[PDB]
């Protein structure tokens, strides 16, 4: 049994339903974010970025972890809708000033010691 | 007779002896539904009975405030209402049942 208590969801089905509701809300919100913050990206770029964030935590199989992730996503959406975030906060998702780092062994061997 | 109890939001109560009697009777009625061996019932019944007895034995408000040692009889009425609400909540909670879920082996060990 392992005797654990829930946050919101009983199993993975309800957790997936909450995930889908959060995704719908973010997808609806993206064009308003592009308009209000005067972003130079397109709506497609924003929705692709939204999709990318969800995919990152796709592997998780625990309903409590999924519930907490949905709570955090709702908090982030609330920050975005009320314009508590600024333009810099929204653009931090895109890492525009970070130089790309190669994943190949040779590139890493050449630059430094880090694995 | 008295005005301006001195605490913002606490109005002056007229006829406080009757109000205290009603509140203590209601508290006793609510406590009557708790099991006899429960500690909350007997402790609260004891203290409420002392307060009711000293209420029924003093018609002067200033001396009653001095005897109750409860700080300005309007606050005594407020505390009686709070106790009645707590008694209802405890009847709902039933916290006299045995302990549930003893803690892990070293949950409360300090240092480390």
């Amino acid at each position: 049994g392992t005797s654990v208590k829930p946050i919101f969801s009983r199993d993975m089905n309800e957790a997936k339903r909450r995930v889908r509701e959060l995704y719908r809300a973010w997808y609806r919100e993206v064009p308003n974010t592009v308009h209000l913050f005067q972003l130079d990206i397109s709506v497609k770029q924003g929705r692709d970025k939204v999709r990318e964030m969800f995919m990152k935590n796709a592997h998780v199989t625990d309903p409590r972890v999924v519930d907490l992730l949905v709570i955090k996503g709702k908090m982030e959406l609330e920050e975005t809708i009320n314009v508590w975030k600024q333009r810099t906060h929204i653009m931090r998702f895109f890492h525009e000033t970070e130089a790309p780092r190669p994943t190949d062994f040779l590139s890493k061997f050449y630059v430094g010691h880090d694995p | 007779l008295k005005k301006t109890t001195g605490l913002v939001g606490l109005a002056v109560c007229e006829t406080p002896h009757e109000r205290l009697k009603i509140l203590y009777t209601k508290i006793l009625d609510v406590l009557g539904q708790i099991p006899k061996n429960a500690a909350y019932r007997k402790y609260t019944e004891q203290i409420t009975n002392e307060k009711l007895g000293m209420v029924k034995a003093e018609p002067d408000v200033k001396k009653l405030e001095e005897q109750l040692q409860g700080g300005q009889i309007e606050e005594v009425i407020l505390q009686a209402e709070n106790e009645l609400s707590l008694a209802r909540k405890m009847l709902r909670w039933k916290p006299w049942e045995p302990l549930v879920e003893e803690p892990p082996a070293n949950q409360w060990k300090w240092p480390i």
Binding site: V4, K5, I7, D62, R64, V65, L68, I71, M75, E76, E78, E79, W84, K85, Q86, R87, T88, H89, M91, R92, E96, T97, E98 | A39, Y40, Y43, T44, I47, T48, G71, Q79, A80, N82, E83, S85, L86, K89, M90, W93, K94, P95, W96, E97, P98, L99, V100, E101, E102, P103, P104, N106, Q107, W108, P111, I112
Partner: protein, 208 residues
């Protein structure tokens, strides 16, 4: 023994012990332990499920009347299966006393919000959520309070690094403030200070 040593008060110690026994007797369902420190501070260790009842009792009981919540914070002890220790400090103005209530939780277990008992809890729980990641159920409005917008992690956890993972600067190409991985010109220097000789024999632990 006289001039440099703090004097102890035994009347307050006896009174606090008696009240701890009183509270433990009234609420056997939730009270796991009661302690009185030797500088006369009373603590009550409870099961998490009794956060709301116990507090309510302490707030509304005629003999307790702890109507002020002085502080509410968390402590992180990674070696415990339940990582986080939740601490309530309560003050009774009627009896001029203080009491401490303690419980525990882990990363995935919610604790019931105590805003219905004390209004002051509203921000404190938010801080606990921001700094430690402990979720409070039925909180009217739970979100970050201290950290920057979009900040990731809970900095008051023991495994969170002191300087964090990201740092901010102004970039002229994008004409805005940007975040990057932390790089320090001088690394913070860790000091190993503990003496290899035991200081306090009264706290020695059994050799297992």
């Amino acid at each position: 023994t006289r001039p440099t040593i703090r004097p102890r008060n035994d009347v307050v110690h006896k009174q606090l012990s008696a009240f701890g026994q009183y509270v433990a007797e009234i609420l056997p369902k939730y009270v796991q332990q009661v302690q009185v420190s030797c500088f006369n501070e009373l603590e009550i260790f409870i099961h998490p499920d009794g956060v709301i009842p116990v507090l309510t009792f302490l707030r509304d009981h005629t003999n307790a009347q702890f109507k002020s919540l002085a502080d509410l914070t968390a402590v992180d002890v990674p070696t415990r299966q339940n990582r986080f220790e939740i601490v309530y400090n309560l003050l009774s103005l009627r009896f001029n006393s203080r009491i401490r209530v303690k419980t525990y939780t882990d990363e995935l277990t919610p604790i019931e919000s105590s805003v219905t008992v004390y209004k002051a809890a509203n921000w404190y729980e938010r801080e606990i959520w921001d700094m430690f990641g402990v979720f409070f159920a039925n909180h009217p409005d739970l979100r970050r309070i201290l950290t920057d917008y979009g900040f990731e992690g809970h900095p008051f956890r023991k495994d969170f690094p002191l300087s964090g993972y990201v740092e901010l600067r102004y970039d002229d190409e994008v004409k805005r403030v940007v975040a990057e991985p932390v790089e320090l010109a001088q690394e913070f220097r860790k000091f190993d200070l503990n003496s290899p000789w035991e200081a306090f024999p009264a706290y020695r632990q059994p050799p297992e």
